[PDB]
Amino acid sequence: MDVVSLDKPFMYFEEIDNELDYELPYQGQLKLLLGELFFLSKLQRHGILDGATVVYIGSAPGTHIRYLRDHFYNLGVIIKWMLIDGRHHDPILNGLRDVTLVTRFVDEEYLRSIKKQLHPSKIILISDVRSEPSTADLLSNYALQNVMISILNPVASSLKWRCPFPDQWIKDFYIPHGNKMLQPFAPSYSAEMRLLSIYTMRLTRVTKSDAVNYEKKMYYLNKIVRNKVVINFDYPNQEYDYFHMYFMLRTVYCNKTFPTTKAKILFLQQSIFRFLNIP
Ligand SMILES: Nc1ncnc2c1c(C#Cc1ccccc1)cn2[C@@H]1O[C@H](CSCC[C@H](N)C(=O)O)[C@@H](O)[C@H]1O
Protein backbone atom coordinates (compact mmCIF):
# COMPACT_ATOMS: atom_id res chain seq x y z
CA MET A 1 0.00 0.00 0.00
CA ASP A 2 1.50 3.32 -1.11
CA VAL A 3 2.07 5.73 1.77
CA VAL A 4 0.24 9.05 2.11
CA SER A 5 -0.11 11.87 4.63
CA LEU A 6 -3.65 13.07 5.37
CA ASP A 7 -5.31 15.43 7.83
CA LYS A 8 -8.75 13.86 7.30
CA PRO A 9 -10.43 11.17 5.19
CA PHE A 10 -13.10 11.71 2.57
CA MET A 11 -16.34 11.52 4.58
CA TYR A 12 -18.87 12.32 1.82
CA PHE A 13 -18.98 11.68 -1.92
CA GLU A 14 -18.73 15.39 -2.71
CA GLU A 15 -15.25 15.47 -1.15
CA ILE A 16 -13.67 13.08 -3.68
CA ASP A 17 -11.29 15.31 -5.64
CA ASN A 18 -10.14 13.05 -8.51
CA GLU A 19 -11.37 10.28 -10.78
CA LEU A 20 -10.12 7.18 -12.59
CA ASP A 21 -11.36 5.00 -15.45
CA TYR A 22 -13.13 1.97 -14.00
CA GLU A 23 -11.81 -1.48 -14.92
CA LEU A 24 -12.51 -9.23 7.00
CA PRO A 25 -14.99 -11.60 8.68
CA TYR A 26 -18.57 -10.28 8.47
CA GLN A 27 -17.34 -7.01 7.00
CA GLY A 28 -20.87 -6.13 5.89
CA GLN A 29 -22.19 -5.92 9.44
CA LEU A 30 -19.21 -3.74 10.39
CA LYS A 31 -19.88 -1.43 7.43
CA LEU A 32 -23.55 -1.02 8.37
CA LEU A 33 -22.75 -0.61 12.06
CA LEU A 34 -20.28 2.22 11.49
CA GLY A 35 -22.52 4.06 9.04
CA GLU A 36 -25.54 3.88 11.34
CA LEU A 37 -23.53 4.78 14.43
CA PHE A 38 -22.35 7.82 12.45
CA PHE A 39 -25.84 8.77 11.26
CA LEU A 40 -27.57 8.30 14.62
CA SER A 41 -24.76 10.02 16.52
CA LYS A 42 -25.09 13.02 14.20
CA LEU A 43 -28.80 13.07 15.08
CA GLN A 44 -27.84 12.83 18.75
CA ARG A 45 -25.64 15.92 18.34
CA HIS A 46 -28.63 17.83 16.91
CA GLY A 47 -30.77 16.78 19.88
CA ILE A 48 -33.33 15.03 17.67
CA LEU A 49 -32.46 11.39 18.36
CA ASP A 50 -33.91 11.50 21.87
CA GLY A 51 -37.57 10.51 22.02
CA ALA A 52 -37.65 9.27 18.42
CA THR A 53 -38.52 5.88 16.94
CA VAL A 54 -36.06 4.26 14.55
CA VAL A 55 -37.94 2.47 11.77
CA TYR A 56 -35.44 0.17 10.06
CA ILE A 57 -36.76 -1.43 6.85
CA GLY A 58 -34.75 -4.25 5.35
CA SER A 59 -33.14 -4.80 8.75
CA ALA A 60 -32.71 -8.58 8.61
CA PRO A 61 -30.61 -10.36 9.76
CA GLY A 62 -29.41 -7.15 11.44
CA THR A 63 -26.89 -8.64 13.86
CA HIS A 64 -25.14 -5.27 14.16
CA ILE A 65 -28.37 -3.52 15.20
CA ARG A 66 -28.12 -5.10 18.66
CA TYR A 67 -24.88 -3.16 19.20
CA LEU A 68 -26.71 -0.01 18.08
CA ARG A 69 -29.49 -0.50 20.66
CA ASP A 70 -27.19 -1.40 23.55
CA HIS A 71 -25.03 1.64 22.73
CA PHE A 72 -27.83 4.20 22.91
CA TYR A 73 -29.60 2.36 25.73
CA ASN A 74 -26.41 2.57 27.80
CA LEU A 75 -26.22 6.31 27.01
CA GLY A 76 -29.70 6.78 28.47
CA VAL A 77 -31.16 7.92 25.14
CA ILE A 78 -34.83 6.96 24.93
CA ILE A 79 -35.19 5.16 21.58
CA LYS A 80 -37.78 2.68 20.32
CA TRP A 81 -36.72 0.37 17.48
CA MET A 82 -39.06 -1.06 14.83
CA LEU A 83 -37.24 -3.57 12.62
CA ILE A 84 -39.30 -4.60 9.59
CA ASP A 85 -38.17 -7.25 7.12
CA GLY A 86 -39.73 -10.17 5.30
CA ARG A 87 -36.84 -12.38 6.37
CA HIS A 88 -36.29 -13.35 9.99
CA HIS A 89 -33.97 -11.23 12.12
CA ASP A 90 -30.90 -12.43 13.97
CA PRO A 91 -32.13 -14.08 17.20
CA ILE A 92 -29.68 -11.89 19.13
CA LEU A 93 -32.32 -9.16 18.75
CA ASN A 94 -34.72 -11.26 20.83
CA GLY A 95 -35.99 -10.39 24.27
CA LEU A 96 -35.61 -6.60 24.05
CA ARG A 97 -38.74 -4.73 25.12
CA ASP A 98 -37.76 -1.55 23.27
CA VAL A 99 -37.10 -3.45 20.01
CA THR A 100 -40.08 -4.56 17.91
CA LEU A 101 -39.42 -7.29 15.34
CA VAL A 102 -41.84 -7.28 12.40
CA THR A 103 -41.79 -10.06 9.79
CA ARG A 104 -43.30 -8.38 6.75
CA PHE A 105 -42.37 -6.92 3.38
CA VAL A 106 -43.51 -3.31 3.41
CA ASP A 107 -45.65 -1.77 0.70
CA GLU A 108 -47.43 1.56 0.36
CA GLU A 109 -50.47 0.31 2.29
CA TYR A 110 -48.38 -0.98 5.19
CA LEU A 111 -46.31 2.20 5.37
CA ARG A 112 -49.59 4.06 5.86
CA SER A 113 -50.52 1.88 8.85
CA ILE A 114 -47.04 2.16 10.40
CA LYS A 115 -47.35 5.95 10.21
CA LYS A 116 -50.83 5.90 11.75
CA GLN A 117 -49.67 3.88 14.76
CA LEU A 118 -46.50 5.93 15.42
CA HIS A 119 -47.89 9.38 14.65
CA PRO A 120 -47.20 11.95 16.10
CA SER A 121 -43.86 10.60 17.39
CA LYS A 122 -40.62 11.45 15.59
CA ILE A 123 -39.71 8.78 13.04
CA ILE A 124 -36.11 8.16 11.97
CA LEU A 125 -35.83 6.02 8.85
CA ILE A 126 -33.05 3.57 8.01
CA SER A 127 -33.68 1.61 4.79
CA ASP A 128 -31.35 -1.11 3.52
CA VAL A 129 -33.83 -2.93 1.27
CA ARG A 130 -32.72 -4.77 -1.85
CA SER A 131 -34.40 -7.08 -4.36
CA GLU A 132 -26.71 -9.10 -8.86
CA PRO A 133 -29.42 -6.42 -9.06
CA SER A 134 -30.48 -4.86 -12.35
CA THR A 135 -31.21 -1.17 -12.95
CA ALA A 136 -34.95 -1.84 -12.90
CA ASP A 137 -34.41 -3.42 -9.48
CA LEU A 138 -32.55 -0.34 -8.21
CA LEU A 139 -35.17 2.00 -9.68
CA SER A 140 -37.99 0.11 -7.95
CA ASN A 141 -36.00 0.11 -4.71
CA TYR A 142 -35.42 3.86 -4.88
CA ALA A 143 -39.05 4.46 -5.81
CA LEU A 144 -40.00 2.53 -2.66
CA GLN A 145 -37.60 4.59 -0.55
CA ASN A 146 -39.14 7.82 -1.81
CA VAL A 147 -42.52 6.34 -0.90
CA MET A 148 -41.12 5.54 2.56
CA ILE A 149 -40.14 9.18 3.05
CA SER A 150 -43.36 10.63 1.63
CA ILE A 151 -45.55 8.48 3.91
CA LEU A 152 -43.46 8.03 7.07
CA ASN A 153 -42.23 11.64 6.81
CA PRO A 154 -39.20 10.95 9.02
CA VAL A 155 -37.35 13.73 10.77
CA ALA A 156 -34.22 12.16 9.26
CA SER A 157 -33.34 9.21 7.06
CA SER A 158 -30.41 7.04 5.99
CA LEU A 159 -31.05 5.46 2.59
CA LYS A 160 -29.12 2.82 0.68
CA TRP A 161 -27.82 4.73 -2.34
CA ARG A 162 -25.94 3.21 -5.27
CA CYS A 163 -26.33 4.90 -8.63
CA PRO A 164 -27.07 2.56 -11.55
CA PHE A 165 -24.05 1.96 -13.73
CA PRO A 166 -23.93 4.30 -16.76
CA ASP A 167 -23.70 1.33 -19.15
CA GLN A 168 -26.98 -0.04 -17.70
CA TRP A 169 -28.94 3.23 -17.72
CA ILE A 170 -32.69 3.17 -18.31
CA LYS A 171 -34.07 6.61 -17.44
CA ASP A 172 -33.49 9.56 -15.16
CA PHE A 173 -34.93 9.24 -11.65
CA TYR A 174 -35.27 11.30 -8.48
CA ILE A 175 -33.83 10.90 -4.97
CA PRO A 176 -34.10 13.07 -1.85
CA HIS A 177 -31.60 15.77 -1.08
CA GLY A 178 -28.98 14.80 1.46
CA ASN A 179 -25.33 14.10 2.13
CA LYS A 180 -23.93 10.96 0.52
CA MET A 181 -21.96 9.36 3.34
CA LEU A 182 -19.00 7.18 2.35
CA GLN A 183 -18.76 3.74 3.95
CA PRO A 184 -15.49 2.29 5.29
CA PHE A 185 -15.01 -1.46 5.08
CA ALA A 186 -17.35 -1.57 2.11
CA PRO A 187 -16.48 -4.25 -0.45
CA SER A 188 -13.29 -3.52 -2.32
CA TYR A 189 -14.93 -1.84 -5.33
CA SER A 190 -18.43 -1.08 -4.08
CA ALA A 191 -19.93 2.22 -5.24
CA GLU A 192 -22.59 2.23 -2.51
CA MET A 193 -23.06 5.16 -0.14
CA ARG A 194 -25.68 6.10 2.47
CA LEU A 195 -27.86 9.10 1.62
CA LEU A 196 -28.22 11.03 4.89
CA SER A 197 -31.10 13.52 5.04
CA ILE A 198 -32.36 15.86 7.75
CA TYR A 199 -35.78 17.29 6.89
CA THR A 200 -36.71 20.89 7.70
CA MET A 201 -38.37 16.95 1.08
CA ARG A 202 -37.04 18.25 -2.25
CA LEU A 203 -36.14 15.63 -4.85
CA THR A 204 -33.07 15.70 -7.11
CA ARG A 205 -32.83 14.46 -10.69
CA VAL A 206 -30.13 11.83 -11.28
CA THR A 207 -28.81 11.70 -14.85
CA LYS A 208 -26.64 9.28 -16.82
CA SER A 209 -23.75 11.72 -16.45
CA ASP A 210 -24.10 11.58 -12.67
CA ALA A 211 -23.85 7.81 -13.05
CA VAL A 212 -20.55 8.27 -14.89
CA ASN A 213 -19.28 10.69 -12.25
CA TYR A 214 -20.20 8.24 -9.48
CA GLU A 215 -18.52 5.32 -11.25
CA LYS A 216 -15.28 7.22 -11.82
CA LYS A 217 -15.05 8.98 -8.44
CA MET A 218 -15.80 5.77 -6.54
CA TYR A 219 -13.26 3.80 -8.60
CA TYR A 220 -10.55 6.33 -7.80
CA LEU A 221 -11.62 6.09 -4.15
CA ASN A 222 -11.53 2.28 -4.11
CA LYS A 223 -8.44 1.72 -6.28
CA ILE A 224 -6.22 4.59 -5.11
CA VAL A 225 -7.47 6.25 -1.92
CA ARG A 226 -8.51 3.19 0.08
CA ASN A 227 -5.26 1.33 -0.71
CA LYS A 228 -3.08 3.94 1.03
CA VAL A 229 -1.35 3.90 4.42
CA VAL A 230 -1.81 7.14 6.36
CA ILE A 231 1.67 7.33 7.85
CA ASN A 232 1.00 10.42 9.97
CA PHE A 233 -2.03 8.65 11.49
CA ASP A 234 -1.34 7.75 15.15
CA TYR A 235 -3.18 4.44 15.39
CA PRO A 236 -2.27 0.73 15.59
CA ASN A 237 -3.56 0.32 12.01
CA GLN A 238 -2.89 3.08 9.48
CA GLU A 239 -4.73 1.62 6.49
CA TYR A 240 -7.14 4.22 5.13
CA ASP A 241 -10.30 2.32 6.10
CA TYR A 242 -9.19 2.46 9.74
CA PHE A 243 -8.35 6.14 9.29
CA HIS A 244 -11.82 6.53 7.77
CA MET A 245 -13.49 4.55 10.58
CA TYR A 246 -11.55 6.51 13.20
CA PHE A 247 -13.08 9.79 12.02
CA MET A 248 -16.58 8.30 12.05
CA LEU A 249 -16.15 6.85 15.56
CA ARG A 250 -15.12 10.21 17.06
CA THR A 251 -18.63 11.59 16.48
CA VAL A 252 -19.93 8.84 18.80
CA TYR A 253 -20.88 9.69 22.37
CA CYS A 254 -19.90 7.54 25.28
CA ASN A 255 -20.68 7.51 29.00
CA LYS A 256 -17.16 6.43 29.94
CA THR A 257 -14.34 8.98 30.08
CA PHE A 258 -10.99 8.45 28.39
CA PRO A 259 -7.59 10.14 28.79
CA THR A 260 -7.38 10.84 25.04
CA THR A 261 -9.59 10.72 21.96
CA LYS A 262 -7.42 7.94 20.53
CA ALA A 263 -8.09 6.01 23.73
CA LYS A 264 -11.83 6.39 23.12
CA ILE A 265 -11.83 5.32 19.46
CA LEU A 266 -9.57 2.37 20.25
CA PHE A 267 -11.99 1.24 22.97
CA LEU A 268 -14.95 1.72 20.63
CA GLN A 269 -13.31 -0.26 17.82
CA GLN A 270 -12.37 -2.95 20.33
CA SER A 271 -15.98 -3.05 21.53
CA ILE A 272 -17.37 -3.14 17.98
CA PHE A 273 -14.92 -5.76 16.68
CA ARG A 274 -15.42 -7.96 19.74
CA PHE A 275 -19.21 -7.99 19.43
CA LEU A 276 -19.02 -8.73 15.69
CA ASN A 277 -16.33 -11.37 16.38
CA ILE A 278 -13.64 -9.65 14.29
CA PRO A 279 -9.97 -10.22 15.28
N1 LIG B 1 -40.49 -4.05 1.01
C2 LIG B 1 -39.62 -4.61 1.86
N3 LIG B 1 -39.90 -4.57 3.18
C4 LIG B 1 -39.03 -5.11 4.04
N5 LIG B 1 -37.87 -5.71 3.79
C6 LIG B 1 -37.60 -5.75 2.48
C7 LIG B 1 -38.41 -5.23 1.45
C8 LIG B 1 -37.71 -5.48 0.22
C9 LIG B 1 -38.18 -5.05 -1.06
C10 LIG B 1 -38.66 -4.64 -2.08
C11 LIG B 1 -39.32 -4.11 -3.24
C12 LIG B 1 -39.20 -2.77 -3.56
C13 LIG B 1 -39.89 -2.25 -4.64
C14 LIG B 1 -40.71 -3.06 -5.40
C15 LIG B 1 -40.83 -4.40 -5.09
C16 LIG B 1 -40.15 -4.93 -4.01
C17 LIG B 1 -36.55 -6.13 0.55
N18 LIG B 1 -36.47 -6.29 1.91
C19 LIG B 1 -35.35 -6.86 2.65
O20 LIG B 1 -34.20 -6.08 2.41
C21 LIG B 1 -33.08 -6.86 2.87
C22 LIG B 1 -31.84 -6.55 2.05
S23 LIG B 1 -30.31 -7.17 2.79
C24 LIG B 1 -30.43 -6.51 4.47
C25 LIG B 1 -29.15 -6.60 5.29
C26 LIG B 1 -29.31 -6.09 6.72
N27 LIG B 1 -29.18 -4.60 6.77
C28 LIG B 1 -28.29 -6.73 7.66
O29 LIG B 1 -28.30 -6.35 8.86
O30 LIG B 1 -27.51 -7.59 7.19
C31 LIG B 1 -33.51 -8.33 2.81
O32 LIG B 1 -33.48 -8.89 4.12
C33 LIG B 1 -34.94 -8.27 2.26
O34 LIG B 1 -35.77 -9.23 2.92
Active site amino acids = 160
Please indicate whether residue 153, judged by its CB atom, sits closer than 6 Å to ligand 1. Answer: no
CA-closest residue to ligand 1 atom 19: 58
CA-closest residue to ligand 1 atom 8: 129
Please indicate whether residue 129, judged by its CB atom, sits closer than 6 Å to ligand 1. Answer: yes
Q: Burial code of 101-115, b = ≥16 C-beta within 10 A, e = fewer?
A: bbeeebeeeebeebb
Residues with Cβ within 8 Å of 237's Cβ and at least 6 positions away in sequence, in order, are none
Query: What is the number of other CB atoms lying within 10 angstroms of the CB of residue 193?
Result: 22
Is residue 31 within 8 Å of residue 272, measured between CB atoms?
no
- Domains held by the chain: number: 1
CA-closest residue to ligand 1 atom 12: 141
Resolution (A): 2.5
Determine the residue of 26, 81, 88, 105 to mutate for testing ligand 1's pocket, defined as the one with the most ligand atoms within 8 A of the Cβ atom: 105
Residues with Cβ within 8 Å of 163's Cβ and at least 6 positions away in sequence, in order, are 191, 206, 210, 211, 214, 215
Q: Cis (ω within 30 of 0) for the bond into 9?
A: no
Q: Could you give the CA distance from residue 101 to residue 88 in angstroms, rounded to a whole number? A: 9
Going from the Cα of 85 to the center of ligand 1, the distance in angstroms, rounded, reads: 6
Q: Could you give the CA distance from residue 99 to residue 217 in angstroms, rounded to a whole number? A: 38
Q: Could you give the CA distance from residue 269 to residue 275 in angstroms, rounded to a whole number? A: 10
Closest CA to 192 of 242, 151, 132: 132
Domain interval for residue 69: 1-279
Please indicate whether residue 130, judged by its CB atom, sits closer than 6 Å to ligand 1. Answer: yes
Expt. technique:
X-ray
Query: What is the number of other CB atoms lying within 10 angstroms of the CB of residue 116?
Result: 9
Please indicate whether residue 84, judged by its CB atom, sits closer than 6 Å to ligand 1. Answer: yes
Please indicate whether residue 87, judged by its CB atom, sits closer than 6 Å to ligand 1. Answer: yes
Instruction: Indicate the pairing of strand 123-127 with strand 156-161.
Output: parallel
| Residue ranges with strand state E in the chain | 3-4, 53-57, 80-85, 99-103, 123-127, 156-161, 173-176, 179-181, 193-198, 203-206, 229-230
Q: In what order do the strands lie in the sheet with 123-127?
A: 99-103, 80-85, 53-57, 123-127, 156-161, 193-198, 179-181
